[model samples]
Target: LRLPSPEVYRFVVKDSEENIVFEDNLQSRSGIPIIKGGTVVKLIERLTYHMYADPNFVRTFLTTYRSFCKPQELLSLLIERFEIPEPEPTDASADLKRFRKEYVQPVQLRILNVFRHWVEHHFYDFERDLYLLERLESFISSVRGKAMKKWVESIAKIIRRKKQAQANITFESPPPPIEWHISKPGHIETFDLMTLHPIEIARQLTLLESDLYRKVQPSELVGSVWTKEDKEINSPNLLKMIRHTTNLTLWFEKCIVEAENFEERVAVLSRIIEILQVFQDLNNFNGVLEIVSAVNSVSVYRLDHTFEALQERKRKILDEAVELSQDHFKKYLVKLKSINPPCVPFFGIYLTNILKTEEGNNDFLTRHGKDLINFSKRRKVAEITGEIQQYQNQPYCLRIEPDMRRFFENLNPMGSASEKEFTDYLFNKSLEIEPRNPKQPPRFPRKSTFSLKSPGIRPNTGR
Candidate 1:
């Protein structure tokens, strides 16, 4: 539990009914160093002052400061502490090295250790705050002495390397925009989904989804930001996932409808079911739901004749998929907890829960007649989104098939057609293939219906 007040700058140790026996600066000399809570500047003061001796304090400060302090604020104070002047000589015996060593040098080196710890672990703070990077560079350049300056230079090396890594990372590949246009020649010649093994397809999809889900930070989900009006600014990753899901769903519809024959459409649907089973085996709930969405989608599900043509076992499997994703996803919720990772969960449920929680909770609450930011609300929301963080850390065991991954990544089934046009085409194509309750025989039925009867009788036969 957090302490009673989050502003603990001083500690008082005394008997309940007597005069206070002890009150000390938060800087611990011999015991545990965590303050009850404190402001950023005092924490910085305490962090730098006893940082040399109180290594434990520095450890926790680095971990815990994000709740109340900004990284740039910490950098500013850290540099200020480093820039503290050297002590003046009081006597003829006092020399430059010895006087500096006794006071300012110890404090300054200790400050460097703080920075080094930060650069080593929380380098993203520096990476994000270019101003902080320049500030640190100025301090490092001004640092005196071989040992101290070298330590600062070591941090600079780490910073440079981190920046290079940032530059080297994959650029964001935004999904193509939805528009009304003719399907391009390139779109017609796109990679075939059935060319690869279903298991490999699932693996490639899981690998692709694992990275996508992992990139979404918890901050994006807070306050239901992903569902807000300006989500493009705050939750680009969420939008990316949503778009991919749309593509997956529509891709299935496109595949099923564009097939030349009844058996081929059945083959495509069967392939989808196979992939969905593999997704379940791999514990990719995200894939499971995407397939579920595809199977339940109006364009795919509306093909009654296609479903009728599918094998009975696949039909049963499709039933399970539909049921698993239903009931406001309560079944999906239970399945998620019972399953192990590395798994990619259906993130829409999380987004909805966050939006609901945000709507239900207040931003501030009155305690002891004072209004404080309701940390409880954020944490409550954290408890929901933290599952994403947990699963993102757990990686898939499968290796990447770069060619297949690239194929799926580049797959755009709709080919620039708007949603209405695409769905309408699929629906009309469905009617063209098999009219509802057809009075006459369909073209693809090489063998007429009721052409063959099943063997005698099962044990559970009708009376």
Candidate 2:
């Protein structure tokens, strides 16, 4: 038998704003409308009950009741009328068995059948609207009845399985390759980092991060070095990300290295600090770290006088950024926790934390000497993956010019015309700006004095 009854509505009507339009008034007895037939009801002798077994009567009741109610109202009414009561626990076996047989079994089956039919009818209307479906799912899950709870859980499992299958089939196909062209470092020799706008520079840097994100293979986070064949199956993005990070680091240092004088080098450093501020404002934490790490690199950091020359405000911004990135981004995590989606996290730092967590915790735990529960490693991995997924639909709004981006991609900090062979290339170059000890006579190594070739200074004066 169907669980929902024709009397489910109990003669209630409400407008869109939920102000009650009509409700049965028992005291005044002014509710019953005219009927086609039913013993010719009059005020003195009104028909108190209708025959529910009559299909025509049930159909008429439902049709008239639904004319005033919306779909949401009807659904709520149906859920309330058909909701099963929770079974009571008792010490008596016979009473418990009777309760299961009389109340639990039949009502559960009826609810399940009714829910299946309801889904078939309304799922199409709500499928595309996740908000509505979530509301419906919440209603079912919150039902105090076991039958409704189980049905919600079962449907949720089905949805998850379908989503996983669809994702596995389609996720491997990467996004369309962004157009980029490579060139010699000399092509950009005249390009001045100081001349670029902070947003433009940040945009190009964010685009680089975006490309790296696209190539990120989930397998790389697992921390296993696969063979060539294994690499073929894994996402090629992690390696690409690392490579880009290295290139960007070198580029930052190189910008400083190639500057012709103290003021030029200071300008380059100031521009980088400005770019870092933009990255921070944009929530591009990875870019923040990339520039910060580069600035803090030995080559750049060794120039104490250059840093001392930085404007007071610019120095404060750099210091704050470096503070956020310190100790595995503890401060940055606090900042990230306060913001919602459409945010760019430093995935490199996140991945490192994931690996550390995986190494430190047990993958599985034995619970109550029976069940094997894995709430540590796999959950941590899933949480990180879920966080990354939150931004999948968010658009990257960095407006970088195409030609500039291509130029950035092609830049090789260690070029052929320069001394690329030396491991301490930037370090040696930085020595050109290193403040001299007035106490000790000037000491310049012939091998490391290549930076002296620039026309900015005379070899004798340490200025």
* TM-score attained by model 1: 0.61
Clashes of 1: 1
Best by TM-score: 1
lDDT of each structure?
A: 0.65, 0.53
TM-score of each: 0.61, 0.49
| Candidate 2 lDDT over residue span 1-463, tens digit each | 1222224333122111122111235542553432321111110011112211223322232222221233355456445434534334444356556655664455444444444444543343244346656666776666565555676666666555544654581333333322222222335543445544445567677766765665453434443222234443332556667667777778888887667466666766887887787677667788888888888887777677778888899899899988987886889889888875445677767567666766786533433332232322443454554466455455464444666677667766767644345328778777765745533222432322222222211112222
Pairs that collide in candidate 1 are 8-37
Off by over 4 Å in 1: 1-132, 135-161, 167-190, 227-236, 363-373, 424-463
- What is the TM-score (0 to 1) of candidate 2? 0.49
> Candidate 2: which pairs clash?
215-237
